[PDB]
Amino acid sequence: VRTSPTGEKVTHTGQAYDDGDYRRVRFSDRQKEVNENFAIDLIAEQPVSEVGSRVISCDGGGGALGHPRVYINLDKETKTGTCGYCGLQFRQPH
Amino acid sequence: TRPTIRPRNDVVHKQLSAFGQYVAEILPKYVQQVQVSCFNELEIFIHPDGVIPVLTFLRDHTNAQFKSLADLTAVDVPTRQNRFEIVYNLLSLRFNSRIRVKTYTDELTPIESSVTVYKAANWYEREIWDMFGVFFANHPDLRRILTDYGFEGHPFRKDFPLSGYVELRYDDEVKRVVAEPVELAQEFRKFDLNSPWEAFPAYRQPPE
Amino acid sequence: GLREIRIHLCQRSPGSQGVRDFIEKRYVELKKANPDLPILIRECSDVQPKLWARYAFGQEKNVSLNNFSADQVTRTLENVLSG
Amino acid sequence: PTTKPPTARKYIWTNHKFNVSGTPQQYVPYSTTRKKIQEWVPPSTPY
Amino acid sequence: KLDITTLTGVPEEHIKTRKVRIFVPARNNMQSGVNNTKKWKMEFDTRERWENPLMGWSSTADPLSNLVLTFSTKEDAVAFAEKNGWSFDVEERKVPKPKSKSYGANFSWNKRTRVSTK
Amino acid sequence: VKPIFSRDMNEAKRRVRELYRAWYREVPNTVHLFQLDISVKQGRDKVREMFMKNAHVTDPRVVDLLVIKGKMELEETINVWKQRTHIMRFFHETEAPRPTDFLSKFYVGHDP
Amino acid sequence: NLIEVFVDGQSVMVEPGTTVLQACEKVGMQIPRFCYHERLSVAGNCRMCLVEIEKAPKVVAACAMPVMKGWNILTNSEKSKKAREGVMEFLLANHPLDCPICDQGGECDLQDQSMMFGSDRSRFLEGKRAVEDKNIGPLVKTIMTRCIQCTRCIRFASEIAGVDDLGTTGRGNDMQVGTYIEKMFMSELSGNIIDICPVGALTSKPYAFTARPWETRKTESIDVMDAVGSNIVVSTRTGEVMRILPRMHEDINEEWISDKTRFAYDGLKRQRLTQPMIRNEKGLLTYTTWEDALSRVAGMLQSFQGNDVAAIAGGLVDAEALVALKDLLNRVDSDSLCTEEVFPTAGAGTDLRSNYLLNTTIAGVEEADVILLVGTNPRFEAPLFNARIRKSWLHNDLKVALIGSPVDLTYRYDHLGDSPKILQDIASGNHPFSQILKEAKKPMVVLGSSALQRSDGTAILAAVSNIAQNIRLSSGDWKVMNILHRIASQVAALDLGYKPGVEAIRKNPPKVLFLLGADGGCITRQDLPKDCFIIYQGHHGDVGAPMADVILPGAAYTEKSATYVNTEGRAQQTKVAVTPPGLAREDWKIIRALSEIAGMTLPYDTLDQVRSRLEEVSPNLVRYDDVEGANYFQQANELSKLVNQQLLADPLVPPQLTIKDFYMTDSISRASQTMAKCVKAVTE
Ligand code: SF4
């Protein structure tokens, strides 16, 4: 969560009010509600799982409590397979 | 067997068809078409002139005693020249059956009031006049119900926008609630949901 | 001073037959005589043939050419040129 | 909760905040999307 | 010469300054279905939409922005537009022209229609 | 065509004149009862303006329906069904003037 | 020889060779399809077209089965419904559960056809397959696990695009669609594969994740990037343009649009002129009110008259603004209204419409037997015209020859040469190709506007006219002379009397020059008088804007309803999709307001009145979707011979020789980030 030149806290979307913008007045004696937790950083932090099969399935964890089950091809050595929903990454060993 | 599908009762279908033919024969002057839906509902289509005569026939026992006007309403189909389809729903408690009589009108053509026959059509016809633009002649008191006292347009007309043309707010300058042109802060998002593929082949209209 | 002349004719209408004849026969000579004068030939549908003469500063006048023989159209165009 | 503790997640707040309406911490709505249309920046040279 | 403009209750600005388009909606090229190309549609002219200062939501002042009507035939839509006194523009229906399809042509002996891959 | 109340334009004009008489006499009573701050002349001018707005009608049925709507509005005003807000809505006091010249519309906004 | 067949008991008369699917279409029944596209060839792989023919044990593929007389097509029999259910189950067995994240969701043929002709549950209790995704370029996002192997993309690339780079590798359930190597599918019509693909396997990268189908509002409009006049649907949500989708016009664009048309809308979001700008004392443009800038330009307009005031019209301007500016300048007695494209003035010039129109309409190409292209690369200058040429080449065995630099037009052609002298050889009859033209029953000759833009354009036009006249002498309804324009505004400007080319401004430098979206750069301040007052009215500030004293914000084609005439002479009107940005206003309104301020008010005050003025100037402009035209080749050819210009020896070279040139050719395209990315992809 970086801070913009005006002193506002830039959101995860990247939204920050420019010095020219008059809409910054809305926070004059109030606060701008920004979620400190950023999805991109946390998803990056997760370790990459290494699986020995060409295709693996991600349900998001918790079965029916997660996301629709999808099968990911891991043939490409260069790039890890990434779940469309979960965002977790997998790659074949070696 | 076939648990999902609705059970069909042919007996009621035959009875309703027979009674529809009965009505068509007794009043050929006004009835144009009678059809029985496959959910066992009977509709008699009448010329606009026949509302009072056909309804009076239905109420009085020519083997039919529909003495309760379930509801009266109109359906605005702009395509048709007579854009308004007046619909009467009647209930016969003696024979525990319900039939529907439908007629058509234009914006400029009056239709006779049925307050004489049923007496529950006063408010229904007033609502039809207020929302749709139909005028019922010889009505005891035709005025607006369900719309604002100064409302100008006729809603429910398929031309009227859902949000209308005017909006109300309180103005300190005039110390009064004042109407103004509608200005939505979030325009109603029109969703095009119809699928490009036909769903029911049974109702496929002829290519023409 | 003429700045441009517009001739509007219907392709198949009987009224535009004379204008079509003038175009087929006399237009090349007209363009030769007036090399730099813009004579724009355009097609009009289900309306009477007309001649538009844009003069200096944008003043324009239109003369109906409906059911005019080629000679009549030539006379009208020459009169416009002469002014 | 003492008998059955809630699942521990990092994102979950550690300090619960009461309703903050009428206070400097009150939520203020704002757009979360960037400017859609970008205008031309006139050249800084005279010509 | 039917005119319901006085009775409709529409304000004069929308009656006079609005152009209504009568058309058969074109098929969404993303899909091969043609069921949504079988009825004429009447749609009003687009007008200004601006962003709400508070939230950025698209705001409008056009009462008929979302108003769309379906008509079985072009003549009925024209009649409705004339009766309501809206200036109308009618775009003629576009129908896919008949095509000649031959699977055998894919394997022609001498023509260029032969397909390199199946 | 079936006549709503009048078979010809002259009869509809007679009905319109009767309605105009009714409104013209009602106007002072409206100013008194609704405690409106407009003058009687102002209200009667507004009545004339409302009548003149539909002066272009040439069809008897449309005129008859307009007279019916006007009679309903008059009944509302004669009773106190309409409030001072409804009566004063005919005078668009809150709404700002909207320029009709081409240049002013061009300056103000994209509206045609 | 129509034969009688029955569809569900209804008699339909169909020509021999009609497929069962088309016979059903005759009665209104649309047989479910996944792999069949009418534009493309028949494949039969999908197997969803299976239907039952009465008294026939085996169901037939409606797409690939020619009807036989007396056949009764039972389109709703139990067998047909069961076949559809089984094929749908097989299609969905290995399909990924990506619908919530699939862009095609809400507009997916698989989804709708499953909801209409398929079962509501899955019996598949095994693991699904996954396919490694292929990279085919910066425009098409590929998720191949969603592929249903319909082969539509391969057949499209082979037949329409002409690029045989997409194919199937492997066999069985492991069969995969895509270049075996790391090749990139580059073509003008590549984006159309996104539209053609039934599933969201191939999707637009620029449009990825932006919106869902139901939200979007669709506005039918015409493209302005090229003179083809392709009909398009502008999809807008919440007042923002989301994508451009092709609209079917069999005559102009069948169902396809060029990559520039499809993906150049992103430019409209960048480098926009949103406020009036006036030069300050330092010489730096500053935002000003409408009144101030209009008054300044009005004072300049009042000060000068005649040749002192000049106008240059860009490629993207509209007919209404053209007529408004023409009238305004004429009131100051200035006829120096110039387009940025040069058309030979000598001879009839703009006087005769046939002279500067593609007389043989784009549809006509199919009927033609021989096409001679002179100094034009139709693939990049007019992609859909080249696509039509390839269609005729593939189906009607059209013979194509090119006089110009050797270029890849996606179809085999005879390269006569690049020297302009060859036209003289064809006209004289020495060249062997002249005999081919003489024998040709329906010959066609196309001269690109780019070739006319050369110094020797007049001589080139005269030589091509000589070729056409010789053809006519040897052997009507058919028109053999055509010019292919590459700028949208050119045809309308010539119809309105705008002088082709900027030569007049070059001859007589104007004190006040009004640039109507003129970003070409043909005329610059150095050419003009030192104190020249330059007014720029345009959507983007690319070249003309930076060199203008007064900048008047104007609308774009998406933001206004305007008449643009295509190369064929057909006039089509765009419709408003979004409001002009900021303080920008419609161009004709700007011209009219300047007229009012300057004391010469143009008669029109509404768009309809401006169209009426257009009807006055040129009746055809207001006749929308009409290409009737007129033949005046005799008079134009007679006028051409009067002058004898000699063509220069420089070889005919199209301005665009490779796909890199195509991407950025106008202000909107140049502003677009996507086009820049495509240019980087092709170059690097
Ligand atoms: S990528 Fe799409 S168009 Fe190509 S074969 Fe697969 S499903 Fe068909």
Ligand code: SF4
């Ligand atoms: S294209 Fe495939 S993933 Fe996308 S909605 Fe259709 S079936 Fe689902």
Ligand code: FES
């Ligand atoms: S495309 Fe489905 S069987 Fe031919």
